[PDB]
Every structure is written in structure tokens, then in C-alpha cells.
PDB file of C-alpha atoms in Angstrom:
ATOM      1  CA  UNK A   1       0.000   0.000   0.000  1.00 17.88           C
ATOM      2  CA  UNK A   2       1.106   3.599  -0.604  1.00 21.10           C
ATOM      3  CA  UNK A   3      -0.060   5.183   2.287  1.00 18.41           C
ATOM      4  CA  UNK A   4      -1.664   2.054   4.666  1.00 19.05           C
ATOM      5  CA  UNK A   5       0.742  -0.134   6.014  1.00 20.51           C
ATOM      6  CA  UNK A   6      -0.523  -3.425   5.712  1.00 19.09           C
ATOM      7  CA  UNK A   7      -1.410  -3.738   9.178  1.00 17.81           C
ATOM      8  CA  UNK A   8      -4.593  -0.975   7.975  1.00 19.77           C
ATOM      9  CA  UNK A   9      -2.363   1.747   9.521  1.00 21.36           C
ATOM     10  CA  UNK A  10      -1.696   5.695   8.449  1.00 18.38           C
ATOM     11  CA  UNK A  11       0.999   7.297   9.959  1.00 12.81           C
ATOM     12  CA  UNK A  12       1.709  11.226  10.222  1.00 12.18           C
ATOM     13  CA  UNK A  13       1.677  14.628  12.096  1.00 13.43           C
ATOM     14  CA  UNK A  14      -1.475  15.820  12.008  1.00 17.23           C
ATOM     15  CA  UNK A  15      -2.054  18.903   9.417  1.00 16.47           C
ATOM     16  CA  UNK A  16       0.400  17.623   7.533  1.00 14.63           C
ATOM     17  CA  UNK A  17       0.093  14.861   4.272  1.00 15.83           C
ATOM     18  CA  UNK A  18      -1.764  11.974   4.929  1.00 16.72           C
ATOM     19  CA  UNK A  19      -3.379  13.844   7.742  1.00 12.13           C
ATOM     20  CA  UNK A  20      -4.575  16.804   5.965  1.00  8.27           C
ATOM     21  CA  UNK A  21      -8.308  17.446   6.524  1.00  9.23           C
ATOM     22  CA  UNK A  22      -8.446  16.808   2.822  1.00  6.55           C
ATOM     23  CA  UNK A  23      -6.370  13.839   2.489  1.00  8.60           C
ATOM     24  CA  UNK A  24      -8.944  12.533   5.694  1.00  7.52           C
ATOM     25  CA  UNK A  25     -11.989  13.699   4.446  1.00  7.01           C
ATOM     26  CA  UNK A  26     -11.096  11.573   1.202  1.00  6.09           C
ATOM     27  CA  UNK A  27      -9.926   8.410   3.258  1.00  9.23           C
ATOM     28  CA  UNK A  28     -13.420   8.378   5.314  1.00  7.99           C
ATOM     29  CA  UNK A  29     -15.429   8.936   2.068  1.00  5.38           C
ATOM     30  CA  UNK A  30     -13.541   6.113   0.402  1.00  5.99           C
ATOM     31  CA  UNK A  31     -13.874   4.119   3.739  1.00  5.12           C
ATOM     32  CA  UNK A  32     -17.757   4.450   3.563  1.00  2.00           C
ATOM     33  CA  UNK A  33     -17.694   3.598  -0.281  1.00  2.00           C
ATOM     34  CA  UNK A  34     -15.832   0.287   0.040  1.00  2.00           C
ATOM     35  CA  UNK A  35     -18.039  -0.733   3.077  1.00  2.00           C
ATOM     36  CA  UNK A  36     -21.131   0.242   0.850  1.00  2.00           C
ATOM     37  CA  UNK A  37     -20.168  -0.590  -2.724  1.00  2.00           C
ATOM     38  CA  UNK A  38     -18.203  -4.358  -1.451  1.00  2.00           C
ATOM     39  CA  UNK A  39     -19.794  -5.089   1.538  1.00  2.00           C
ATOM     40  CA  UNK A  40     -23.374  -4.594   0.467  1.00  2.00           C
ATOM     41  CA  UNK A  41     -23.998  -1.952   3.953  1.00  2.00           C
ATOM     42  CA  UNK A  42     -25.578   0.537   2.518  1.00  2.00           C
ATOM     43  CA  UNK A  43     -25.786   2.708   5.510  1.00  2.00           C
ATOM     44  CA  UNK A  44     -22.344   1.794   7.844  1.00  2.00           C
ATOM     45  CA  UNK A  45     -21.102   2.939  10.667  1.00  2.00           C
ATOM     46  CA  UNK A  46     -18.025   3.866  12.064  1.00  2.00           C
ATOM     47  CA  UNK A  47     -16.337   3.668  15.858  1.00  2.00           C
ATOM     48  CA  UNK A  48     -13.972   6.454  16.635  1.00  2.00           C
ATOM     49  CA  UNK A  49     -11.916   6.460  20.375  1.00  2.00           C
ATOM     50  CA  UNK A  50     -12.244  10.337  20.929  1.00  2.00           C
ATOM     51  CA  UNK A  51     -13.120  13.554  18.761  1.00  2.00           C
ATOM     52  CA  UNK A  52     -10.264  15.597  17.468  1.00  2.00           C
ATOM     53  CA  UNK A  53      -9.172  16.941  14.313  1.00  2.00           C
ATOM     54  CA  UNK A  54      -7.886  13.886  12.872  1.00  2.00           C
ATOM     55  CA  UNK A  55     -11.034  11.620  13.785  1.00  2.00           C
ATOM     56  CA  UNK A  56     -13.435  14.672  13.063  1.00  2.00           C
ATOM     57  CA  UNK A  57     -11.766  15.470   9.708  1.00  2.00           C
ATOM     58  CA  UNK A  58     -12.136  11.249   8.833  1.00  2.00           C
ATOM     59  CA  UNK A  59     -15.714  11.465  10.248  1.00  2.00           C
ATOM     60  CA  UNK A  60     -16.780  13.936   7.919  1.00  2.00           C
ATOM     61  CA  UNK A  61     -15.843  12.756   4.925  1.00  2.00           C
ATOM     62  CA  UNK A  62     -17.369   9.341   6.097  1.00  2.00           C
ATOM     63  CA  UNK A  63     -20.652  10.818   6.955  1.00  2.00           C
ATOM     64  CA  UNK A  64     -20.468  12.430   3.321  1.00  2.00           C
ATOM     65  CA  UNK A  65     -20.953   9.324   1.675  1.00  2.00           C
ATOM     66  CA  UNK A  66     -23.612   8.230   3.594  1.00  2.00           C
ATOM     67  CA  UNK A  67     -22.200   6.494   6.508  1.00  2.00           C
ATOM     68  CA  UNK A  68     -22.595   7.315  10.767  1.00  2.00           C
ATOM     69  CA  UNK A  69     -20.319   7.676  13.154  1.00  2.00           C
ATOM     70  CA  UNK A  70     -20.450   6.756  16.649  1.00  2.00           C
ATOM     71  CA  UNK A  71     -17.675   7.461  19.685  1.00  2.00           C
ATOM     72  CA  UNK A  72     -16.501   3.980  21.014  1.00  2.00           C
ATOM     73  CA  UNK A  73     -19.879   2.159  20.144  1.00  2.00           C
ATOM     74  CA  UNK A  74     -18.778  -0.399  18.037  1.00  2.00           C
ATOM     75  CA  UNK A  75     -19.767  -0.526  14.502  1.00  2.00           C
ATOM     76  CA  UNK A  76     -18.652  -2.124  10.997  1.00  2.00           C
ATOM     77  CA  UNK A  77     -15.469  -0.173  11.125  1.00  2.00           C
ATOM     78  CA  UNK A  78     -13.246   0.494  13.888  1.00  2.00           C
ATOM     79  CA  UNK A  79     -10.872   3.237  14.648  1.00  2.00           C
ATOM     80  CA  UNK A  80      -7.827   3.012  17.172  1.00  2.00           C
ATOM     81  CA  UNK A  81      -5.824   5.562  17.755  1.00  2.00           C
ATOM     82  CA  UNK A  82      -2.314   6.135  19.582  1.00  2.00           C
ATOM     83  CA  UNK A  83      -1.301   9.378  19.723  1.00  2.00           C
ATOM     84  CA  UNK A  84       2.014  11.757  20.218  1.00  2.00           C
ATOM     85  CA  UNK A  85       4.210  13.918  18.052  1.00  2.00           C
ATOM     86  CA  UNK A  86       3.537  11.065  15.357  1.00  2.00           C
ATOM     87  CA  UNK A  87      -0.415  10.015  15.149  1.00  2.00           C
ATOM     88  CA  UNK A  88      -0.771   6.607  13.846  1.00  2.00           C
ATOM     89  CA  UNK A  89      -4.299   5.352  13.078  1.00  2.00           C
ATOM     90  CA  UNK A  90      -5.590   2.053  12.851  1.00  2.00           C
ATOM     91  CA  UNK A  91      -8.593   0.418  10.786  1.00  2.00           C
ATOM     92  CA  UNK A  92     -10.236  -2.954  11.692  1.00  2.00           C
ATOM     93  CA  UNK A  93     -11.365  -4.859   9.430  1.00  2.00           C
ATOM     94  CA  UNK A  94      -8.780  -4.731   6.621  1.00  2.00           C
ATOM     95  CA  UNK A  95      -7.742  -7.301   4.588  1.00  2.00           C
ATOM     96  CA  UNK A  96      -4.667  -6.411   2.348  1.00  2.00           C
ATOM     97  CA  UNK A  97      -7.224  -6.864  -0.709  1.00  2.00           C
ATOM     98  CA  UNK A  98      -9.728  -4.277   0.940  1.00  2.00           C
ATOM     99  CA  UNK A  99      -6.837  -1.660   1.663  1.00  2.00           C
ATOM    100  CA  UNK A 100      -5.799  -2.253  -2.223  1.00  2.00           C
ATOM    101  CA  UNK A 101      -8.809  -1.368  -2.920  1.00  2.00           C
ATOM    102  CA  UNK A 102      -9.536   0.983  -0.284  1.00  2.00           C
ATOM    103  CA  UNK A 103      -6.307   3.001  -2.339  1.00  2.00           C
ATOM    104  CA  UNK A 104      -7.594   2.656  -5.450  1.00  2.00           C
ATOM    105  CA  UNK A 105     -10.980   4.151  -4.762  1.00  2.00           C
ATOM    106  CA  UNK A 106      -8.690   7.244  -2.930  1.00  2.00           C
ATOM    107  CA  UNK A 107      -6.484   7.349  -5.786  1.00  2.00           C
ATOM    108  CA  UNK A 108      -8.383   7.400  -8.250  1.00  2.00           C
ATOM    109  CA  UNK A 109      -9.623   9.918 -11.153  1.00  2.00           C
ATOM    110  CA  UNK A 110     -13.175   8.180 -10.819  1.00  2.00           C
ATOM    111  CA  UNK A 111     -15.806   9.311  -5.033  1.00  2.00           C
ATOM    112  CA  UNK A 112     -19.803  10.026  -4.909  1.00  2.00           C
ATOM    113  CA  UNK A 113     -21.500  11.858  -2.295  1.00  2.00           C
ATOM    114  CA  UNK A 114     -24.549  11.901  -0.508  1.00  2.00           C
ATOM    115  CA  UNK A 115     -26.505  15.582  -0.013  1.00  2.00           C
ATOM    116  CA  UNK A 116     -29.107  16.791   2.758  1.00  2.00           C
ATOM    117  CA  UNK A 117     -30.921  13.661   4.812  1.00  2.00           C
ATOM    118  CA  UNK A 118     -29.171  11.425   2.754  1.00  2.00           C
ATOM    119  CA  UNK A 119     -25.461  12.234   4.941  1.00  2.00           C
ATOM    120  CA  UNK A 120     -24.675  10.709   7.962  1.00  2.00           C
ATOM    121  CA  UNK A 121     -25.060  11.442  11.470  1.00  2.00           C
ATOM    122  CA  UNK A 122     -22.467  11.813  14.511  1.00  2.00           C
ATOM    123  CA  UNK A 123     -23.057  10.720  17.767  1.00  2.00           C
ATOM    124  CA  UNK A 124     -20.820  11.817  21.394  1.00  2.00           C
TER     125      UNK A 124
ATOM    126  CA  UNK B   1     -21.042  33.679  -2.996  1.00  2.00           C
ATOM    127  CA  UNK B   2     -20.873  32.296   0.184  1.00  2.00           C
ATOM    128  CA  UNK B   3     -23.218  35.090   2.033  1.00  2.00           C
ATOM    129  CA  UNK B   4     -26.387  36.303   1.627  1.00  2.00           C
ATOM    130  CA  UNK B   5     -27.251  40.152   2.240  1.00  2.00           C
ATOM    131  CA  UNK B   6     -28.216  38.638   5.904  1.00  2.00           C
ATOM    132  CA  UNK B   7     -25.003  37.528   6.806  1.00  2.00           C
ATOM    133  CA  UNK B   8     -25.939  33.985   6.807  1.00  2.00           C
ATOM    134  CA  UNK B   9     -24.831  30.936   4.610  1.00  2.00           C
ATOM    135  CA  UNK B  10     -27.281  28.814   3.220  1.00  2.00           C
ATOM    136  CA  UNK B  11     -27.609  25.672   0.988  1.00  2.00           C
ATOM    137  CA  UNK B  12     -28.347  21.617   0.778  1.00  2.00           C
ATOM    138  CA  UNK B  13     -25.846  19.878   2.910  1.00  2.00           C
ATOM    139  CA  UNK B  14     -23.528  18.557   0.909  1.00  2.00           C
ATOM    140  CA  UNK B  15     -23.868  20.785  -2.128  1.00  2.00           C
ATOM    141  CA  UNK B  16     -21.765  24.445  -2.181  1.00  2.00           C
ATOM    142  CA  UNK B  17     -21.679  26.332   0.071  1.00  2.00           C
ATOM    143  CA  UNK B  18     -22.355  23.783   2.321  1.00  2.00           C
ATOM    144  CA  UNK B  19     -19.534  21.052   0.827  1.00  2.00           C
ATOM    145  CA  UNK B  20     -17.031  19.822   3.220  1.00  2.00           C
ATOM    146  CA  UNK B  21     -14.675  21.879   1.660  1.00  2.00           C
ATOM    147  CA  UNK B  22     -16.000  25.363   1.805  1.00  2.00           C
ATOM    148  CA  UNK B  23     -17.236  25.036   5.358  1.00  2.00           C
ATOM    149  CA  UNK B  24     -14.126  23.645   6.387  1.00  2.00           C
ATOM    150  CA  UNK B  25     -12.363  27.384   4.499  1.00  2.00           C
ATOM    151  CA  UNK B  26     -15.288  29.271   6.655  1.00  2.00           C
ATOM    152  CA  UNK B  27     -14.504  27.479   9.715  1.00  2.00           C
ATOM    153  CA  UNK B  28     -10.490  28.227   9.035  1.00  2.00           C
ATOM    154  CA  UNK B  29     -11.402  31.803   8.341  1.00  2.00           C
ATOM    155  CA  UNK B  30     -13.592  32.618  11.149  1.00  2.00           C
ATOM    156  CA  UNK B  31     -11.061  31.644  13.410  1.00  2.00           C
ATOM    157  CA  UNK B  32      -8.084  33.648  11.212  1.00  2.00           C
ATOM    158  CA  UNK B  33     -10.535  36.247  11.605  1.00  2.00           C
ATOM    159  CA  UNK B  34     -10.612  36.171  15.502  1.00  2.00           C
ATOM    160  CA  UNK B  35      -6.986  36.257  16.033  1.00  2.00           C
ATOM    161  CA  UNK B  36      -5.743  38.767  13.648  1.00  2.00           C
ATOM    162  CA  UNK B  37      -8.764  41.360  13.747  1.00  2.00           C
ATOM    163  CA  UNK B  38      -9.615  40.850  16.908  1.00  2.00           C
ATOM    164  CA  UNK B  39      -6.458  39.997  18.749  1.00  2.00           C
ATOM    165  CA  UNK B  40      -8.286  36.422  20.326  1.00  2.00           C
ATOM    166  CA  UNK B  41      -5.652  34.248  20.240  1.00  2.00           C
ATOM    167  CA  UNK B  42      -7.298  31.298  21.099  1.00  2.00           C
ATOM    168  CA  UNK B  43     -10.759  31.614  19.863  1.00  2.00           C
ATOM    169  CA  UNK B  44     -13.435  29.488  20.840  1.00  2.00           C
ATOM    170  CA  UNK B  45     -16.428  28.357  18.356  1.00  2.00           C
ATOM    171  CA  UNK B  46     -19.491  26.948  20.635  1.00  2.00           C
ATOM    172  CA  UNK B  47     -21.887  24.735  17.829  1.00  2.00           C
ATOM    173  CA  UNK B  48     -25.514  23.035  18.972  1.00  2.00           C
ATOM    174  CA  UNK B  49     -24.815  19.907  17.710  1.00  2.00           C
ATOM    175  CA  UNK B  50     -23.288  17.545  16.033  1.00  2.00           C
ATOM    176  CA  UNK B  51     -24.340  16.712  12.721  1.00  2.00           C
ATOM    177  CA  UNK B  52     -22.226  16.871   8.861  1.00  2.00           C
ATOM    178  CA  UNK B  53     -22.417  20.682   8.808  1.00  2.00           C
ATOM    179  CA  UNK B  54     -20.923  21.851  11.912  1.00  2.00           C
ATOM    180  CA  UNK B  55     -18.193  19.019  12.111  1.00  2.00           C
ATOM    181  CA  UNK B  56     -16.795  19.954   8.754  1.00  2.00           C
ATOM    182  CA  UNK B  57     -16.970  23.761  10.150  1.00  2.00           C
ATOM    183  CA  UNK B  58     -15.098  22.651  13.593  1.00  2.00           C
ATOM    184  CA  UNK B  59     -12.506  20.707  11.652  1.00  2.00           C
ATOM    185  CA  UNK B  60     -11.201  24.103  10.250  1.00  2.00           C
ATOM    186  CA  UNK B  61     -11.996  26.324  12.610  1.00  2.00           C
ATOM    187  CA  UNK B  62      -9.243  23.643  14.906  1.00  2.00           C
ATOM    188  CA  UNK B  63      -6.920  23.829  11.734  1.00  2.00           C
ATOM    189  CA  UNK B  64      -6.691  27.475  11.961  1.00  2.00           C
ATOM    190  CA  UNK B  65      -5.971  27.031  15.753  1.00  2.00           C
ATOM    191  CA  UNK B  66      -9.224  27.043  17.078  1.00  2.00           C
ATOM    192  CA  UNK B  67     -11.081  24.570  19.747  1.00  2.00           C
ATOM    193  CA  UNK B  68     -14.402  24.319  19.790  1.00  2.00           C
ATOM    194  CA  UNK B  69     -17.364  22.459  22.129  1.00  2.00           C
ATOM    195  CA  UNK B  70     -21.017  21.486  21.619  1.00  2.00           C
ATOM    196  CA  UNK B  71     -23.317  23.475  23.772  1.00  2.00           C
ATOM    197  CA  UNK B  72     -21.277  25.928  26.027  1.00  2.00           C
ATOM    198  CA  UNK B  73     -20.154  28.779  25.194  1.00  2.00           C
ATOM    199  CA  UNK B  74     -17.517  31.137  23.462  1.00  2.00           C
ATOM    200  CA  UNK B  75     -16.020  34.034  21.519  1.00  2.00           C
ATOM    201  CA  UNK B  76     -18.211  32.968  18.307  1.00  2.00           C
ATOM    202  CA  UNK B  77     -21.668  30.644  18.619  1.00  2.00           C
ATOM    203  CA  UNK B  78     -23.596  29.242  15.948  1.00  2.00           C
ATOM    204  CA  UNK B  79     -26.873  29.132  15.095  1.00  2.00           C
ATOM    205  CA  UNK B  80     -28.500  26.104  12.661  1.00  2.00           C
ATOM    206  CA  UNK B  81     -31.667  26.310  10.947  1.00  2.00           C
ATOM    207  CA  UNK B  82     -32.383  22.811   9.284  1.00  2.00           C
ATOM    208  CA  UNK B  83     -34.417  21.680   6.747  1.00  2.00           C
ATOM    209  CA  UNK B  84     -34.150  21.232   3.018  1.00  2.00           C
ATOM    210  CA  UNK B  85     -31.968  24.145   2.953  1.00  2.00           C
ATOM    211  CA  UNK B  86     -29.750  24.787   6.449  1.00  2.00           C
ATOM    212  CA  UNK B  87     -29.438  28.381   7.328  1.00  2.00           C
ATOM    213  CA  UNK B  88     -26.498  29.298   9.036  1.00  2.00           C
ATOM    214  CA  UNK B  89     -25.988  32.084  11.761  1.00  2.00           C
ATOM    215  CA  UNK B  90     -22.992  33.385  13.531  1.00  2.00           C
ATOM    216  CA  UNK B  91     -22.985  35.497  16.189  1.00  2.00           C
ATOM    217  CA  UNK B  92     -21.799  38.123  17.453  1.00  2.00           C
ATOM    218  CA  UNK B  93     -20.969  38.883  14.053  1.00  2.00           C
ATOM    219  CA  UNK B  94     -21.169  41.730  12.524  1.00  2.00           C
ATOM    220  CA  UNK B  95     -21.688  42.675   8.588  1.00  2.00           C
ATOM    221  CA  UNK B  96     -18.375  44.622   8.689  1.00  2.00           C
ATOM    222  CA  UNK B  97     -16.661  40.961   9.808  1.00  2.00           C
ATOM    223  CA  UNK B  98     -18.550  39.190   6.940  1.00  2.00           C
ATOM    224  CA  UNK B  99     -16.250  41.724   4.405  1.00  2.00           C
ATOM    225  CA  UNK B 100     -13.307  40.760   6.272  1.00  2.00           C
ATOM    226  CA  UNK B 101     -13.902  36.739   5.982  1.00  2.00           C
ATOM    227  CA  UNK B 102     -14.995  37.334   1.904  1.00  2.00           C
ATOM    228  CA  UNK B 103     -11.867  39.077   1.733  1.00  2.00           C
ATOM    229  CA  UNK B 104      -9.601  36.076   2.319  1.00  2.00           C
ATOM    230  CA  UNK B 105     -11.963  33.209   1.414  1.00  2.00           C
ATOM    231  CA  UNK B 106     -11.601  34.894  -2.059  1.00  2.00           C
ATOM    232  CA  UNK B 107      -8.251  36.112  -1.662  1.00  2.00           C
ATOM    233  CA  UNK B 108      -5.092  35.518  -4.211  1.00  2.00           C
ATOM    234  CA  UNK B 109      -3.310  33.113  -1.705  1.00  2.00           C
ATOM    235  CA  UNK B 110      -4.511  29.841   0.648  1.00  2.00           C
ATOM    236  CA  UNK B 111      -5.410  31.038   4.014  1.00  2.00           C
ATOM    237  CA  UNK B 112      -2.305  29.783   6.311  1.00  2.00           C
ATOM    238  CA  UNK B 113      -3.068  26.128   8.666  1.00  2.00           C
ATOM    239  CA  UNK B 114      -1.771  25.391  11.780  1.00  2.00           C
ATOM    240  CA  UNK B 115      -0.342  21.769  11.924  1.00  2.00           C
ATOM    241  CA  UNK B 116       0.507  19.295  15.136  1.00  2.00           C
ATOM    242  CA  UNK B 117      -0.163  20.615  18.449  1.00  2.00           C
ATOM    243  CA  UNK B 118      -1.314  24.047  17.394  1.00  2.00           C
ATOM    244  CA  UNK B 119      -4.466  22.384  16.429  1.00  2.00           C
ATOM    245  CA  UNK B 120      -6.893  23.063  18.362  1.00  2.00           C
ATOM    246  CA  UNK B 121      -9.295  21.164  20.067  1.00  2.00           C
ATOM    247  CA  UNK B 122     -12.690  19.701  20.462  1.00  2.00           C
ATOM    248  CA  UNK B 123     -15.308  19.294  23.170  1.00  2.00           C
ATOM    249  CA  UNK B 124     -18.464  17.093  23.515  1.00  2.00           C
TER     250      UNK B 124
END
């Protein structure tokens, strides 16, 4: 992967490429397109450990594409994150096949968005 | 535009000027606003909930240095209208600010983001 590891982790200072809040809108939009597009959930959610920019930023751009997000409540997709000079977050469940095509989704020219009651919603 | 003659900011969540994007600039510039023109230099945005709109708004305002919490209060609140088109309020300010915040959200160059810890924060 170019910017996952294979363990489903991205590394970086936040502000700063891959944490921009672009780059992290574009991850959770991608995010809630795999989940919806290959996993057949057309409304998923996703688990964050605490609100700050980083997880906000990702939440945002996962709401945008139709998905919810939740603060440690469990849910299709799972956030961990360790923090420090260096943030490093990690994804659960990711196979190496998902995050390929997790990337290629992000990369890509081709990522569709949702509009009014249609967006997801964010719960403390 | 990004105004009306109001001084409010309405649209279709989702859909300009209510994309991620452009309330994520509004959010950067409010809080640009408060520490150069009015010498704040941690400004605080208070927002009534949580919801697609005034996460992607927080998300800048904390890239510009900001910190913001749901509920309480601080130097700039924000007032949310739903519906099919969201109206958007801020107070306490003033028609005179709304120049100053066009000025730079259309200006030649990127308004400047803080990166690491002078992020600011967020609040539940």
C-alpha cells in the first residue's frame, strides 16, 4: 500500500500529508464507499476512540458518503488511535485486498457523495 | 457567494456552500478572523450539535488554531436552521466581519493552517 501499512495503519503529524483534513476527508469517504459498494452496507457505521481533528476530519468525509459515526460504540469499522508527536491510526477490518482497494478508490480519477438527509449522522 | 445580504450561509448539505470543503475554508477563516482582527488568540467556536455541517466547520476552525465544544459557550456561537436548505448564523458577528472573511476566502493566496499541536481542540 502507498499510504496504509498493511497492518490498515496511516501514519503522520497531524495537518500535515496523509493527515490533511483533505487527504482525511477523502480516506473516510472512500472508507464508507468500500463498506457500501463491497460489503453490500448501505448505511455503515463507524467507531472512533475520541473527537479531534484527525477523527473529526475522517468522520466527515465518512458521513459524506452516507455512513454514521459513533464514539466507542462499536460498529462495521473500527478506529484506534495512539497518539504523540507522530499520530498513527488504525482500521479494523482490513484485509490487504480491501486496503488495495480501499487506495484505489482514494487514488483514483473516478468518489460520490450523498446531499441533505441522505449524509450521515455523529453521535458523542 | 458564500453570504447572503443577511449575513448567513445557506444551501443543501452537501452541495456548495455547504460542501465539506467550503465550510471547512469558513470554519479556518472565522477563526483567522478572531486572532488577527480581533487579537483572540485562542478563539473558541461553541456549535448546537453535532451533525455533517458543523463538524466539517469545527474541523477548520481547529486547523486554523481554534477549539471548539457542543453546547457551552464562546467568543463565536452558531446558530443552525435545518431543513431542506440549512441556514447558518454566527454570532456576534457583525456585517463589517462578513467583508473581512470574503476578503480572504476569495483572496489571491490559501489562508495559512496550523499543523501538530497548534491544532486546536474539540469538546463534547
Amino acid at each position: 500500500p502507498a499510504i496504509f501499512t498493511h497492518e490498515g495503519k496511516v501514519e503522520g503529524v497531524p495537518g500535515n500529508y496523509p493527515l490533511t483534513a483533505e487527504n482525511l476527508f477523502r480516506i473516510g469517504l472512500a472508507l464508507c464507499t468500500l463498506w457500501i459498494l463491497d460489503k453490500e452496507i448501505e448505511e455503515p457505521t463507524l467507531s472512533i476512540p475520541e473527537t479531534n481533528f484527525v477523527t473529526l476530519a475522517l468522520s466527515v468525509g465518512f458521513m459524506n458518503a452516507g455512513g454514521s459515526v459513533n464514539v466507542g460504540k462499536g460498529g462495521d469499522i473500527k478506529l484506534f488511535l495512539q497518539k504523540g508527536e507522530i499520530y498513527v491510526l488504525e482500521f479494523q477490518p482490513l484485509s490487504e485486498t480491501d486496503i488495495k482497494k480501499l487506495e484505489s478508490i482514494l487514488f483514483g480519477r473516478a468518489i460520490p457523495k450523498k446531499t441533505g438527509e441522505d449524509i450521515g449522522s455523529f453521535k458523542c
